[PDB]
Design a protein around this ligand. Structure first.
Ligand SMILES: NC(=O)c1ccc(O)cc1
Length: 167
């Protein structure tokens, strides 16, 4: 049993809810929240901007030190950093950004990072301002992630379309 409430069960391991990923983390304090990161960990907008704002910019300060030491992530890659006031840990995952011309085949590699964690609160990778089709992102998630993933879909309209089109 875990603390996640109000989710629709899609598969053995994938759950979905209409929720802003920022308010859900604050309520649940999950072990792992996933950030929709870029390779520079520049948390300007989208999910990353919202998560970072909720940490009062502490996520960005920690991230800048991580990049100064390690250099940029890979598209499809990840790093584990603090969850600050939102979670124990934040798994910063880089899905391909279609609005930068990145290979959508890298979305499966991105979701493979989730398998290193038994339970996660996450957004749909490469959705929103990353430009991918969220229906596709959900299909890759279901077909790639084997650990227990709780997806927060911000758009009520999109949430309803994802559920009603799910195979
Ligand atoms: N909380 C927000 O402002 C936000 C922004 C983009 C998303 O994809 C999800 C949430």
């Amino acid at each position: 049993v875990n603390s996640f409430s109000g989710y629709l069960k899609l598969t053995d391991n994938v759950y979905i809810k209409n929720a802003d990923i920022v308010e859900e983390a604050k309520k649940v304090k999950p072990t792992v929240v996933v950030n929709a990161a870029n390779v520079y960990l520049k948390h300007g907008g989208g999910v990353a901007g919202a998560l970072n704002k909720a940490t009062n910019n502490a996520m960005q300060v920690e991230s800048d030190d991580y990049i100064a030491t390690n250099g940029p992530l890979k598209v499809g890659g990840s790093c584990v950093l603090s969850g600050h006031n939102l979670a124990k840990h934040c798994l910063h995952v880089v899905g391909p950004n279609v609005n930068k011309g990145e290979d959508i085949q890298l979305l499966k590699s991105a979701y493979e990072n989730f398998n290193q964690h038994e339970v996660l609160l996450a957004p749909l990778l490469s959705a929103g301002i990353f430009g991918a089709d969220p229906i596709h992102s959900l299909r890759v998630c279901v077909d790639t992630v084997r650990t227990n993933v709780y997806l927060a879909v911000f758009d009520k309209n999109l949430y309803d379309k994802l559920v009603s089109s799910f195979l």
